[PDB]
């Protein structure tokens with residue numbers, strides 16, 4: 001129990017900042033995730049033998065897609081880590097356990113295609129889960145890996161603590177369905193402004209945890225411009241693939257997914273920052289003030305996209 005993970009000095013310092021990039025060395029990501037668990041949760045939270053075998057089974061069940069990949073999983077876990085560290089006393093022992101694992105698992109077995117494409121393809125998962133189709137699949141896959149022999153990192157929780165942690169993880173992963181974010185944030189907006197937000201009300205915490213998941217899941221928009229810019233290529237490589245597949249179903253895709261309409265991308269990113277990202281981190285900052293660095297990074301990147309459109313890059 002005296003074995004800490006330690007990181008090189010630049011990573012040790014930069015990992016604590018919201019805008020940290022986990023870097024191109026895949027073999028270091030599991031150690032980065034464990035390091036984050038040890039400092040966020042404790043060295044006692046998980047049996048290291050079990051956690052290591054969980055992490056490696058999770059990694060193996062991420063596919064080789066341009067964006068919805070193992071790197072996305074660890075990137076999203078790091079943003080949750082930063083939120084949790086900058087808000088020490090607001091979160092229970094279980095919530096800190098569940099949420100880092102929820103983030104790591106939130107896109108398990110992603111194929112690079114939206115819930116819409118599955119429905120128009122008539123994919124079997126769309127018959128199994130009529131709404132939040134991939135997100136219900138990600139929770140299913142998370143539970144499957146937890147039930148592999150030697151993989152139950154929760155085995156030392158009590159019956160009821162265990163049911164609490166899986167309930168946190170389920171809602172957490174469902175909340176990453178961006179179709180649910182709009183209504184979720186409107187509600188938190190009203191609650192915050194009419195003063196009725198109440199962090200002891202479990203249905204309120206749930207809404208707040210859901211907004212944190214949307215924030216972590218979108219955190220590509222909160223990195224330094226070079227990282228944001230280069231990730232957007234991966235994001236759009238998946239969208240264009242899906243647009244290609246829509247065209248093979250004899251359906252014109254929305255311009256976002258049409259690779260013939262790449263010119264329209266800078267404007268597409270503006271509407272996204274204005275309609276999703278900025279509102280998301282604004283309301284997050286209102287509820288959890290120390291997350292303001294995400295809002296400032298997001299606004300900085302909105303400004304960079306404006307410059308692309310004005311031909312200044």
Ligand SMILES: Cc1nc2ccccc2nc1N1CCCC1
Nearest residue numbers: 178218219220221232235268272
């Ligand atoms: C357009 C877009 N850009 C993003 C840029 C950074 C991170 C996530 C992003 N997600 C996006 N999608 C998801 C569903 C609608 C548009």
Ligand SMILES: [Mg+2]
Nearest residue numbers: 106107134176
């Ligand atoms: Mg997802």
Ligand SMILES: [Zn+2]
Nearest residue numbers: 072106107217
């Ligand atoms: Zn995701």
